[PDB]
Structure formats: structure tokens, C-alpha cells
Amino acid sequence: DKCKKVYENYPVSKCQLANQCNYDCKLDKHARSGECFYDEKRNLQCICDYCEY
């Protein structure tokens, strides 16, 4: 949804740990769960979600 925003900056490199995204997602865009997802590059991108997915 609109609350879900994706920002690479650091490729799946960090997404290696579901705990990393949230950190960066929280420190970067201030997300809640910063969950990874698959984009056009089938890469895991930490998506900052500010809502109730």
C-alpha cells in the first residue's frame, strides 16, 4: 500500500537478516517492521511500512 515504501541504497546485502531491514528501515525512513520484498530485480529490498499491512 501507500504506507509501504521501498528504498534500496543497500541491496539485499543487509536483507540477509530480517533484523537488518527494520533497523535501516527504522533509522532510514523510520518504519515499523521494515520487511523485505521482491522487486523487478527479484532482489530483497527492505521496505519501510508505516501502517498495518
State the CATH number of the domain containing residue 52.
Answer: 3.30.30.10
Residue 1, CB half-sphere, CA atoms under 13 Å: how many? 6
| Count of domains observed in the chain | 1
The CA distance from 46 to 29, in Å, is: 10
Determine the structural domain holding residue 17 and report its residue range: 1-53
Q: Specify the amino acid at residue 30.
A: H
Phi-psi region of 30 (alpha: psi -120 to 50; beta: other; left: phi over 0): left
The torsion of the CA quartet 44, 7, 48, 33, rounded to 10 degrees, works out to 40
Q: Could you tell me the three cell numbers for 1?
A: 500500500
Q: Is 27 exposed, middle or buried (0-12, 13-18, 19+ CB in 10 A)?
A: exposed
- This entry's atomic model was obtained through NMR
Closest alpha carbon to 13 in 42, 43, 34: 43
